[model samples]
Target chain A: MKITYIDKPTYLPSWVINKINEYGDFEVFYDFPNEEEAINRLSSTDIAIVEWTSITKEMIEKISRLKYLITITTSYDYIDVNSLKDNEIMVSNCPQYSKQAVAEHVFALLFAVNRKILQADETCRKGLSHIYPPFLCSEIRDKTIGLIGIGQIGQTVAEIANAFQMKVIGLNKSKRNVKGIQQVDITELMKKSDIISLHIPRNADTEIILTEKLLSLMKPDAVLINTCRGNLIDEQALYSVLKQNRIRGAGLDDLTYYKDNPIIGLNNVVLTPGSAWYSYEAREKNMYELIENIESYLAQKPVNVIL
Target chain B: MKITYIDKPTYLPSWVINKINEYGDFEVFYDFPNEEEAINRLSSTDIAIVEWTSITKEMIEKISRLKYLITITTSYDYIDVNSLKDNEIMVSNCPQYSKQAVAEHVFALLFAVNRKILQADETCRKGLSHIYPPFLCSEIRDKTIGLIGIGQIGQTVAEIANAFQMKVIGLNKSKRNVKGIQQVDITELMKKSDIISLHIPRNADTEIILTEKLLSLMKPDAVLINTCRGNLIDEQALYSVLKQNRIRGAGLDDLTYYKDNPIIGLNNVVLTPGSAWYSYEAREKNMYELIENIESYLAQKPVNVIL
Candidate 1:
């Protein structure tokens, strides 16, 4: 069987590609068929693994030999699940591999902003540093941290926050008990958190959840961290709050828009280019899991089968 | 009884002055009297508290009414101790209130440099920050920290370091056992330390102790923190090591020269204006102890008295 791996960039570790080759003959493509390329490439492939690029119904119809489509990321918005169902193509997504890496990035951003570590370091490097006489540094100890969506990623973030002695409050679609985290109404969590980290998937219900009205409910010095999905927050409202210093700062690993995003210029926002899931450890784990997932599916004993 | 406090500009806390007023009629002056002003002021005062200003033998001869002289800081170099003894005036110094503040500042500086917290905070304020991906941040857990002096301040620093789970190593003038601290030769401690914090007093024996030869023995990534006295480390040698990147960085609370210190321009040094003892808590503790010392001295039972 032939498999095609369509990734956005060529920065993936060699180990992932090597694992895929061990199972069957596979070709990795940095560029997907733009209607034309898809028609030509999908004609011969039995299966395709994609990252960020979209697979529309038009492109799916061209893949005459395609039996399955897999997305390496947790989100499957780029893949048309309805189209895959119509075409009788199996669809699956890699889950929970990026949790620790993304959660660690959130705290790194928080620690950097709260402690002024970056500024002092640059100043010292340039020989223009000052003692930075003790200022009002808010200790994270005993402060409440509201987690939106107590999933795998949220649980990891809460564990790290608890290590720092922060109170954990969580919000989910359905009430569930999580260790060391109190379930709260979404609106109330916004009003009470010293720091709020978003871990919910981007869906119709979660889109624009962090609107201007909700932002106003946040504490004046509250910090907002978003590593889950970009559309979950209203970018315009967030920009306004950050500009006015209504909220302290934001640690963002993803953005609402992909390329040519307008929020990149905002200084109050720590914007990472959706690379939080790209740590060395996370990459190794992802490759290991990807191989296991593919092998299990082929053996008729599939694991993590979403469809 | 009349008392005068000749601290440098902005050295004394406001509360200390208020508390001293409760004890006696005290005059606070930023600038010391010139030869004539010293004659005028000291001729009438029975007690004097000096900070960073030297009382020469000529000035001491004019102060006929001065019965007691005290220095607010631990070091009493500015006061001519031999002349004061010859004049039959009792001398005392404030001790051990600055330990935690200074030791904590050393960690603050280290964390600031390693984590780049200040730069990130400034970037967040401007809304143009970048995600500082977590790197190999050195943990204080289980790391060895060497203290050069095992006196009151050093003991306090050791206790706090112990709280952070750091193994404390000590090297002092006399052999003494401190709990959780392994006493080692000065040379061995210098070579093995992850961080070396100085608490030794500056005297003939300690002057230029951290010279070129001693500094060369330190690990390439070792950090030197000086909250004790500046003259103990050769300024020129320290500047060379920092310039050459032989060591990581230095967190200095005190320096040999304040206004025109040349280490201010070094890239690998965090220089404070001799303010390790300037915390709100440290100030309150120092003042409370200072007043108590005065009362005890009046009762013919001096506290923190150095014979």
Candidate 2:
């Protein structure tokens, strides 16, 4: 059967692509495709595997031979799942593979900010390091961590927090069966948490939830972490807080807007460009699962089916 | 009985000192004590708690009222452990209170270096942060970590490493059956580890054991972390490897030497003041354990007995 792997070639490693070709005669893009480039190439394709840059309804209608669409990520908001379903195109998403990677990222940020690991590193790298009276690193033990969203990533974060002996409090859209994590309103979470990590996606309900009021409630020594989506916060407020040194710091992985995002140039904040899901073996797992998901659908036993 | 805590009072927090004051009629020296200062004050005292400074045998003889000497540190080397024992002066030391702090420091170093947490922060602070092709951060998951010593501190490090899903290996004086850790020789560990952390002491046999020959055997991307005593490594040789970029980086909480301690000012190596044991709770634990140790000896039931 004819298959097309859409989007950027950089999404999957060469090893993953070589393995996938063993199953079907696949047409793959060596570079990221624009709307016109995708449509021109995918018109005769049957099964399409996509990573970033959506497969819109206009592009979908033109692909006359398309039977299925698979997303290489958990979120399906980019694609019109309902429209694809009406077109008899089966949809599947690779889900929860990055929970371990993303959750651990939460901690990499948590410890980095709380302990002033980066600040210490810069000063010490220049021969400015010295011993002080217990003024160096922080103990994660007994500190309170409030997770903004309670999904697999948040739960994994809580489990690791338990290992560090931190008190885990959670806020969930639906109250999840989060063991050992006390469910709380956002106010209490902001007020008490020594560390706050965000796991909520950028959506209608979540966007702008973390405002100046919620931020002002946090302890002056507390830290705010954003690993999931950055739009969940009011960036100007966060920037102001970080700039004024009103809080300990913010460890941001994802930015709200890729261009003109907030919380930059403030020494009190640490930023990484949305790499919370990149691990040594995370991509390999994601590729293996994406193919396994495709193979299952081809065998008439669909797994991780979203449509 | 009258007791003089002949050490820097900053070692213990005010709360810890207050707790100790309730246990005994104690005088704490906020200023560091010299031999003359110690002799003048301790001459009327029956017991003393000292740290880092030597109470010479002559000084011990002059203070005839000094029936007991307690060390606020893990080691009693400065006071001469055998001399105090021969003088009929009972000696006690606070031990193992900093294992948790030291173990967590290993990760703080490990993660900060591996993730390039500081590097990222610097770039991000300059408004130059951008996503790369999964090449920046090193995931602790499934990576091999070699522990140079497998005492309580190393074991605690292994416990936290297990949470990160890393393969933990240990090299010990004798083979230790740490449940989740695979025991290996120092040679094998050097060859196999993605990261190596030191937890051994500065002793006659152990000095300069991490020689150039052993270090050169390490993986090109391996990191060496030392939180233990300085002088265990060939510092000049370590300087060469880091400068040449033969290995990924080094995270040093303790230096090989205070002066001419090579590997500073190299961007790859991360250094902190020798603070592997200074966490928020570590001081309290050390103080409490110290008082308990003295009480146990007074009641003829010494727990962490050195003599």
Candidate 3:
């Protein structure tokens, strides 16, 4: 079967493609973000190993033999999962590839925001702040962190939180056996936690779920972190709340709105380029999982199958 | 009790001062790190709540009424502990206050250096790097972290390391019961650890322990961290090695040489102002432990006793 990878990641090690060759004939898109080119290439391939570009219904209909799609990312929001389901195309996501990477970035943002590491870095570079005996920063120990979803990313965050001696409350989607983590209702988690990190997926059901009132439930000094998706939160309400300094801070990977959003003006937040899932190990894992998913699908024993 | 605190930190919340007042009549040195100012106050004090200033031999000898010296830090390298012992002065150090804080910063530095968070933040602010499907960073999972000390800070770092799913190889200075951490020789830890953190204090035995020969045993792309003391590492040798790009990076809280050191010119290192243990919560804990040590001493039962 003909296989094509949708986008060119920065560096795909030679070993990854060398190993994928063992499965079937494969092709890769070197110049992506070029939708017409991607669509032209997508037509003949039975399997598409995708990155970020959305797969439209127009392209889906144009495809003559596409049977399987594998998104290298954990979230399938970029690709229309429901649309693919209607087309009877099986899709898989690399769920475990970036779990640890995203979780580490979540904590990196959390610590930077809470402890003012970014601010301190700026000061240190400028030699503007005096070296003091006590530089006054916050610690995560004994503070409560609420994990908004019980997905792999949230589970890993909880384990790391526990090790930092943080009391972790996670939203229970299912009865998870994650140690040292208490599965709590959304409201309880919101009101009680000193910090809440979003790990839920963005989809039709979850679109704009964190309403104004729901966000207002967070304690005055509590922080909100989003490494998952932007649509999970109400942009306008979060902006208003943040402007008032009603919460301690917000550490966001992605902005509530895209570039030039008002949250950039706020002093109490830390925003990174939504690249939490980007890591060397995760990238390699993504390729390995992609190859495994393809091999499994060919063998009629598909794992990580989303639809 | 006549109490003298060595240095003035950022304003101690009135409640903290009030809490300390419950134990004794307190006088804080506003103009501290001034050898004259600290020595002047050190004259008539029965209990001295000291910080980073060197409690000079002159001050130690001229002290007629000075009884207890309490350094508001774990490492008492600056306090002339031997001089205090010779003078029959009792001293206590805050052992557990910043274990989690420093450990978290060790990680914040580790992540910032390895994942290039500081560099990413700089570029993100400059609109240089694209917010993308992947950003190309490294993960600590399954990577070896060589912990050079088995004390509380190292232990806490180890615990956090385990949560990050790292293989922690630590030096066996004394018998340690830190679970999931393999205690190895200094050379082995240096050779294997993807990241090596110095948690050992600076004293006669540990001073210059990470010699050029030992540091040369490290992997070419490995990173070195120092949150403990500059004296533990041979600064000249480490600087030469770091300059050669022989290592992936270095995460340092305080440099071997202070105030615009040549090491600051290096691209691969991340530095903080020796503020790893300086957090709001850790400061409060430092004061609380100070109060507890004072209270415990007044009642004829001293804890965290050094000399």
TM-score of chain A of each: 0.90, 0.89, 0.92
Would candidate 1 be rated incorrect, acceptable, medium or high by CAPRI criteria?
incorrect
DockQ of each: 0.13, 0.43, 0.45
Per-residue CA lDDT of candidate 1, range A1-307, in tens?
Answer: 8887755532456776777788789988876447567655666677777775778888777667787776777888667788788888787778877777676666666654454443433443444422435332354556799999899889988876765557999988878688889999988999999999998887668888888889889999888988777788888888788888887778776666644454555555565555456555566666666776788778867676565
Q: Give the TM-score of candidate 3.
A: 0.90
What's model 1's overall lDDT? Answer: 0.70
Q: Which candidate model has the greater lDDT, 2 or 3?
A: 3
Error of 2 at B55 (Å): 5.7
Q: What proportion of the real contacts between chains A and B does each prediction keep?
A: 0.03, 0.45, 0.43
What interface RMSD does every candidate have?
6.9, 2.8, 2.8
Give the CA lDDT, 0 to 100, for residue B181 in model 2.
83
TM-score of each: 0.66, 0.86, 0.90
Per-residue lDDT of A60 in model 1: 76
C-alpha lDDT (0 to 100) for residue A176 of candidate 1? 68
Off by over 4 Å in 3: A19-23, A33-35, A128-135, A172-181, A256-258, B9-24, B128-135, B172-181
Error of 2 at A295 (Å): 2.5
lDDT of 3 by residue, A1-307 (tens): 8888878765567887877767778787776657777677777688888876888877776666788888887888878777788888889987798888898888878777666666666556655334545346667878999998877888888888887778998875667666678888888888899999988988877878788988999898787899877788897899899999898788778754545667767777777777788887777788778778988999999999996
